[PDB]
Write a protein that binds this ligand. Sequence first.
Ligand code: SF4
Lengths: 83, 695
Amino acid sequence: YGRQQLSLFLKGIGLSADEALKFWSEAFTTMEKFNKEYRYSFRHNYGLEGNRINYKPWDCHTILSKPRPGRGDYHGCPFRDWS
Amino acid sequence: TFQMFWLDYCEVNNTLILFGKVCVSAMVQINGLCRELFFLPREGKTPTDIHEEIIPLLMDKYGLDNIRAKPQKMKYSFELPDIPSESDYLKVLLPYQTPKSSRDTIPSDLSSDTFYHVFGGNSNIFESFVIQNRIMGPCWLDIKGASHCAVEVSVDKPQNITPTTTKTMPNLRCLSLSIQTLMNPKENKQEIVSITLSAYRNNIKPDDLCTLVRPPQSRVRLFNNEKAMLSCFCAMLKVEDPDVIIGHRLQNVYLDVLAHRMHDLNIPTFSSIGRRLRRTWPEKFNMNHFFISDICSGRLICDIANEMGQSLTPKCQSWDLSEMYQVTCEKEHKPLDIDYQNPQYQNDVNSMTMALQENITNCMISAEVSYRIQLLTLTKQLTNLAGNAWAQTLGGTRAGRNEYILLHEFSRNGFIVPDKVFEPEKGLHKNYVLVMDFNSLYPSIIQEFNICFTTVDRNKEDIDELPSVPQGVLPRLLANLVDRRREVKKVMKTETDPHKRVQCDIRQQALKLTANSMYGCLGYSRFYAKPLAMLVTNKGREILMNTRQLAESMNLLVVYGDTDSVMIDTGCDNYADAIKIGLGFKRLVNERYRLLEIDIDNVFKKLLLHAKKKYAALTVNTTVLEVKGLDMKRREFCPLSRDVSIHVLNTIEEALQEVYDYLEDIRIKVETNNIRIDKYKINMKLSKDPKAYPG
RNA sequence: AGGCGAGCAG
DNA sequence: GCTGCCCGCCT
Ligand code: SF4
């Protein structure tokens, strides 16, 4: 959920797809598992895969419609999920 | 006395009926059969105590006048915990036919002050009859003292039937079937339009040739419609009364469709498709397969494209009729695509004639393929080895011949029976690839290490626990079968006549199948035992690792491996050199394991391996294409996709440029729409209702 | 989160 | 034929 929220947000502000791959790959300080599992999902997020649907960013409403965050989660609206 | 070679059986009204022939067909209804119930006494109890306690209670419950009960001493070495190895049981013969509550069973857990365990509580009437009388497959029966036959008798007690030593088996009434099918887009039901019936009563010429047909839109017999056609089919089928019915894919398509069209029209003589007479369909008509199998009990299902049949022609790839004829008989037949929805069949006589000609050709080809590949003889040998149903042997079961063999062998020895890898080298290999089959891996492990139910001390409470290696019962049976196969090989060395040579070939293949289906007993099964299965799996792992080391020592690279087969790359481009290297590897492996007889299974001039079970290859036999596991084998891909795949595989720098050229002109064909649409068809099953899917 | 393919135990 | 779990792959 955090990955999807953050990815669609960073698309909405205007990050390029290649710089998106660059940043996401950088934050994970292996490349093999990346190309195995995350590259396809990230390219699907930009609509650059599958049915070619450039998924419009989640709004505060849709983000709140997501299941509530737990330990290890950071997604949602912190005006709700925090104390 | 009464002499009768039995073929099949059925169960009804707690009675066992054997279907056989006396040569004309005959019946014997077996009443008075008794489940052999064995009760295990408490620590310090006698079978007389069990008698005194339960026998009067059994009389009260089942309302008999007398019950036969005697003490007998038998062994037990199976997976039920805390059951002692040897004790004195009380054999109570509880008949299947009782005045009251014949459908109620005695649970195996009846704990009383005299006995705590019960065996045979859910014994099968056919199974019990066959085990007590020790009948090992279809043979003669010496009989002393309701159906579509001309001969019908019955026996009051099971002991009246004793098996005979004679090895002969008389003439059979054979009948090949090939049915043209029509699909009606209103109810999506497969309606029968024409049937070809050929009887081989005793390139063989049929004794008669009959073809029935109904008008799809508006000897050969013409009919006004389907109903009179099918009633006449039933009548002439009773007149023919064949011992074995033959066909192509009768098991899961054609006989199913025949039975469904039999019901939809509500014909009364639909019981002539078997040998047992009936007036009404079973009430509740996965289960349908069982129901037609039950009603057809009496006539013998000989499917040549079924699992057993297809196991005899691995050189087939789609197992279609023309392909199977071409591979087994080396004769060319062009399959004529006949679709009765075409309007030409309603007014053009010549098209209908060509359709009937193709149907008769299909029926003759099915019969000739059936007789050529010798399915009947091989299955007969398998059954006489296993002692199960030969109807089951043709039916294509796994737990059929892996259970009755153990039942017979252990009951003949006074034993109580319990109640019912290397990563692949993905890519194209230039050198020849040899297929070598280790089907005799586990049985050789069993006979070498003496693993059985009575030799390996295994903690029965903890089935996940591995025991230690300890002659056993299963190893002795396996060794006896292997010695029989050795005698078969020795007679092959000397024999001159092709006929007896081929018969012994059938016999050796039967022994190989029986011996290599012996792990299905305890690995997969009424004889499952996790410690033994896991132990033998470990030892086979050890053997396979040693084989890998040996292959690496002989300058060979293993491309893919499993306990069933081992794939090797010879490093030569010669068929002779590859064969020589494979023989050397076989010899060295047999040197490292004296009971592990391996052989060359298949030869690949070129192999494109994609995954563990996903590959295509140029099989050498002459080179012939093979594919296993690629996308061109699933339903969801159109015949155009399969043709593109087959040509790409056949082609595989010049090959790649040719692939590009073929892709370009097929693209030009597709965008222009210059390819026939039926090449674009996609098929897909729904196991559920169409409405019932989340996605 | 869902579907296609296998293997396992009931 | 039906369920649970493990991994591999796609939306
Ligand atoms: S309300 Fe919460 S989720 Fe919505 S924009 Fe503000 S911080 Fe983000």
